[model samples]
Target: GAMGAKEYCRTLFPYTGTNEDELTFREGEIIHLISKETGEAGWWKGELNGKEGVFPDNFAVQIS
Candidate 1:
């Protein structure tokens, strides 16, 4: 019951949007996946460092 989709940063992604629908993370950083609609065309919603937005799903792996 304490398991879900986890996001691990494999590359550097800079959030260039309007502070939303994206996130800035470094390599080796771990993020939490918090959305139902994901893995579609390489995009998904996640939360990191108390910030929530959309990031590239291909940048991380989905773990259950």
Candidate 2:
């Protein structure tokens, strides 16, 4: 579940993560972030279509 900010971002580019723990998404998909801050640099954790995984931060951009 999202804590504190309830922040969200939409995927702006297509990326295929090399790791199984990472997420693969296409453009125009909304990602529910666990936390933008307090995490690894340029590596973010979020959920898309009910799938939880970490992805490259550059793959998505903050929309709100």
Candidate 3:
């Protein structure tokens, strides 16, 4: 499927992924974001450490 260009974000809070598809991020970590138009509104698709994953939307703030 087609998608838009990726964005970047900084984690506002630390989150440990409970599921395999979720991303585990520490405070202030940067994420390569795909978008909030993901599996659900609560989860935003992003990448960390070169791995694809999703994290809660409120967990991070878009930086561009």
lDDT per model, in order?
0.60, 0.77, 0.75
lDDT of 3 by residue, 1-64 (tens): 1245667778889899998877888889777877677757677787777778876768788764
Q: Positional deviation of 23 in candidate 3, in angstroms?
A: 0.4
Query: What is candidate 1's CA lDDT for residue 55?
Result: 62
- Give per-residue CA lDDT, model 1, range 3-53, as digits (tens): 544444444343444565567666555667677466565567777778888
Taking all chains together, the TM-score of candidate 3 against the true structure is 0.78
Ranking by lDDT: 2, 3, 1
Separately for all candidates shown, the number of backbone clashes (residues 3 or more apart, or on different chains) is: 0, 0, 0
Q: List the residue pairs that clash in candidate 1.
A: none
Question: What's the TM for model 1?
Answer: 0.57
- Work out how many backbone clashes candidate 1 has: 0
Off by over 4 Å in 3: 1-4
lDDT of 1: 0.60
* Model 2 TM-score on a 0 to 1 scale: 0.76
